[PDB]
C-alpha cells in the first residue's frame, strides 16, 4: 500500500478548479479553473508561480506539451488556446468548435492537439499553424475525454453517449467502438502507458480497465462516487502500480491495479475532487476540488 500524506494546499483560484496536470519534466503543476484562469505552481514545494489569462469563459481542461514549454487549454468560450508558459503568451487560439471545449491533449510529438467538445466532435489541430486538420463526427453527445496513445497513432475519445471510440490519427477513421453493458455515460478515458488498454470512468460509480481491441474488461474499480462529474483518473507508476481518481465524496481514491482493492483514500478536500494527477518521476499526487473548496492539494508517499 502507498502512504500518501498531505504536504501542501494551494489556494487562489476564485472559482472551482477543473483540472491539474504535472509538467512532463516534473517541475510544475498547471491548474485550470472556472475562474477563466490557468495557474502554475511548483510541483515539489507547492509554491504559486504565475497566472496565465486570456480565455473569456471558464476552462475545463489544460494539458502540457511534451517539452513542458507549452500548454493548451479548453474553454467554455468554444476555443482552445496554446500558451507559451515561460512568457505567458497566447500563441494561438484554436477556433472551430461550436460549443464548449471540454477536454484536450497534445500528442507525444506535440505537433498536434486533440480536443473534445459539447458539440459532440473530436478535433485534431496543428500546433504550429493553429489550424484544425480534422473534425471527427465522433459521438452523439458531449465528448468528455480525448487522449493520444504512446506513439500518437491513435486517439481514444469518450462521451455521455456511452461509447469509447478509437481513432486513427492519420486518417480520422474510427477503428473501434467499445460497448459497456447498459451504456452508462462515459466521463473519462485514457490509454494505459503501454497503449494496450484504456481506463474508462462511467457515471455509475465505476472505473474499468479495458483491453479495447478485444472488448474485454480486465479490471473494475469501485468504492468511490461518480455519477455527475467528469473526474479524471490516472495510472500511478512511480512506486506501486495504482489507479487514482477523484470522487464526489471529496476524497481521492487509490486502488491496487491488479487486485482492484482500495489501498488508500486521501481526506482533506471539502468538495468534489474533480481532478488528480500523478507526478512523472516522484510518488506525488496533485488533487483539485470544486467550488466549495477551490484548493489544490499535493500529497506524497514514500512508495
Amino acid at each position: 500500500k502507498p502512504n500518501y500524506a498531505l504536504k501542501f494546499t494551494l489556494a487562489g483560484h476564485t472559482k472551482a478548479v477543473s483540472s491539474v496536470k504535472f509538467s512532463p519534466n516534473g517541475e510544475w503543476l498547471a491548474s485550470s479553473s472556472a475562474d477563466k484562469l490557468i495557474k502554475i505552481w511548483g510541483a515539489y514545494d507547492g509554491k504559486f508561480e504565475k497566472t496565465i489569462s486570456g480565455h473569456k469563459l471558464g476552462i475545463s481542461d489544460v494539458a502540457w506539451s511534451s517539452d513542458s514549454n507549452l500548454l493548451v487549454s479548453a474553454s467554455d468560450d468554444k476555443t482552445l488556446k496554446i500558451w507559451d508558459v515561460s512568457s505567458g503568451k497566447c500563441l494561438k487560439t484554436l477556433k472551430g468548435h461550436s460549443n464548449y471545449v471540454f477536454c484536450c491533449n497534445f500528442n507525444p510529438q506535440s505537433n498536434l492537439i486533440v480536443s473534445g467538445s459539447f458539440d459532440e466532435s473530436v478535433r485534431i489541430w496543428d500546433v504550429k499553424t493553429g489550424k484544425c486538420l480534422k473534425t471527427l463526427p465522433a459521438h452523439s453527445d458531449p465528448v468528455s475525454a480525448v487522449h493520444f496513445n504512446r506513439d500518437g497513432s491513435l486517439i481514444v475519445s469518450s462521451s455521455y453517449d456511452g461509447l469509447c471510440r478509437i481513432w486513427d490519427t492519420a486518417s480520422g477513421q474510427c477503428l473501434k467502438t467499445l460497448i459497456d453493458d447498459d451504456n452508462p455515460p462515459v466521463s473519462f478515458v485514457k490509454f494505459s502507458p503501454n497503449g494496450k488498454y484504456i481506463l474508462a470512468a462511467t457515471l455509475d460509480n465505476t472505473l474499468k480497465l479495458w483491453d479495447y481491441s478485444k472488448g474485454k474488461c480486465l479490471k473494475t474499480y469501485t468504492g468511490h462516487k461518480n455519477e455527475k462529474y467528469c473526474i479524471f483518473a490516472n495510472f500511478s507508476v512511480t512506486g506501486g502500480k495504482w489507479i487514482v481518481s477523484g470522487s464526489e465524496d471529496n476524497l481521492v481514491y487509490i486502488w491496487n491495479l491488479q487486485t482492484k482493492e482500495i489501498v488508500q483514500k486521501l481526506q482533506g478536500h471539502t468538495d468534489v475532487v474533480i481532478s488528480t494527477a500523478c507526478h512523472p518521476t516522484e510518488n506525488i499526487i496533485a488533487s483539485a476540488a470544486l467550488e466549495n473548496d477551490k484548493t489544490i492539494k499535493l500529497w506524497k508517499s514514500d512508495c
Binding site: 477543473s18 479553473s33 472556472a34 475545463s60 467554455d76 455521455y160 455515460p185 462529474y229 470544486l290 467550488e291
Partner: peptide, 8 residues
Amino acid sequence: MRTEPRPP
C-alpha cells in the same frame, strides 16, 4: 463546464 454537474 467540467465544474458543473450533469444531472443523472
